[PDB]
Amino acid sequence: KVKLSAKEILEKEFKTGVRGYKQEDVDKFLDMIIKDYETFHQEIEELQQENLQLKKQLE
Amino acid sequence: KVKLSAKEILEKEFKTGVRGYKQEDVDKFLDMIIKDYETFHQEIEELQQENLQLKKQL
Amino acid sequence: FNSREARRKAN
Ligand SMILES: [Mg+2]
């Protein structure tokens, strides 16, 4: 299924090295990805709940 | 709603510093994230089609 | 911390 979560991306620590990516660039970009994971999960939960309610109304 | 995409993640350029996050580790992490974006979209698309079909039955 | 960037700044 899904490999990561918003929490795992928040708490991920990368090791450092010479000529590594600037931390500010990477962390601001991953913060947008974190908001997306939250958006994705909320939409899925909304749809799974609608799916369940539609099913119940059919039977 | 959603800000990024698989293609926006691939296209993203990061500045480098004298030191920074190890590029190999960041990229391999982004590769998993790209795979998750695909999985989210497929899951959402399946659910939308199913709810549409169910809504037609009512 | 609620964001990576806020943690990075504090550190
Ligand atoms: Mg600290």
Author numbering:
A (entry chain B): 5 to 63
B (entry chain A): 5 to 62
C (entry chain D): 5 to 15
Lines quoted from the article behind this entry:
BsGpsB interacts with the first 16 amino acids of BsPBP1. The backbone amides of BsPBP1Arg8 and BsPBP1Glu9 interact with BsGpsBAsp35, mimicking the mainchain interactions in successive turns in an α-helix. The sidechain of BsPBP1Arg11 forms hydrogen bonds with the carbonyl oxygen of BsGpsBLeu14 and a salt bridge with BsGpsBGlu17. Van der Waals’ interactions connect BsPBP1Arg8 to BsGpsBLeu34 and BsPBP1Glu9 with BsGpsBLys32. BsPBP11-32Arg28Ala had no effect on binding, suggesting that the overall positive charge of the peptide is not the primary determinant of BsGpsB:BsPBP1 interactions, rather the unique physicochemical characteristics of an arginine at position 8 in BsPBP1 is essential. BsPBP11-32Ser7 acts as the helix N-cap, a role that is performed preferentially by Ser, Asn and Thr32, and alanine and proline substitutions in helical positions equivalent to BsPBP11-32Ser7 and BsPBP11-32Ala10, respectively, destabilise model peptides. In B. subtilis, we discovered a critical motif, SRxxR(R/K), found in close proximity to the membrane that could be used to predict novel GpsB partners.
GpsB has emerged as a major regulator of PG biosynthesis in low G+C Gram-positive bacteria, and its homologues (DivIVA/Wag31/antigen 84) in Actinobacteria play essential roles in hyphal growth and branching. The PG synthase arginine finger pokes into a negatively charged cavity situated between α-helices 1 and 2 of GpsB and is fixed in the same orientation in all structures, just as the phosphoryl group defines the binding orientation of peptides to 14-3-345. Therefore, the role of GpsB in the bacterial cell cycle is that of an adaptor, docking PG synthases to other cell wall enzymes, scaffolds and shape determinants into protein complexes for division (the divisome) and peripheral growth (the elongasome).
